[PDB]
């Protein structure tokens, strides 16, 4: 229990740093995707890059690095 509580403290400290790094890299990937889309849909009338499908709450991507098939 003592060891597990220490590890829990460690992970609680760690979590915001990885969260921030994830956020920055996801934003950079978003910017690159926007650049690619702007290059692609240049001549399409009525198209707008960076259009938000949602209204209030932001959505994280469906797939992540952690979730992989076992076999």
């Amino acid at each position: 229990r003592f060891e597990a509580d220490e590890i829990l403290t460690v992970r609680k400290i760690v979590h915001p740093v990885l969260q921030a790094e994830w956020d920055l890299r996801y934003l950079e990937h978003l910017k690159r995707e926007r650049e690619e889309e702007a290059k692609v849909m240049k001549n399409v009338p009525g198209w707008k890059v960076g259009e938000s499908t949602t209204r209030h709450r932001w959505l994280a991507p469906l797939e992540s690095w952690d979730k992989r098939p076992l076999v």
């Binding site: 915001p16 740093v17 921030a20 790094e21 956020d23 920055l24 996801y26 934003l27």
Partner: peptide, 13 residues
């Protein structure tokens, strides 16, 4: 929205 925490995240990194 992560965009709204950009300065805090960058400062942390």
């Amino acid at each position: 929205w992560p965009e709204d925490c950009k300065p805090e995240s960058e400062a942390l990194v």
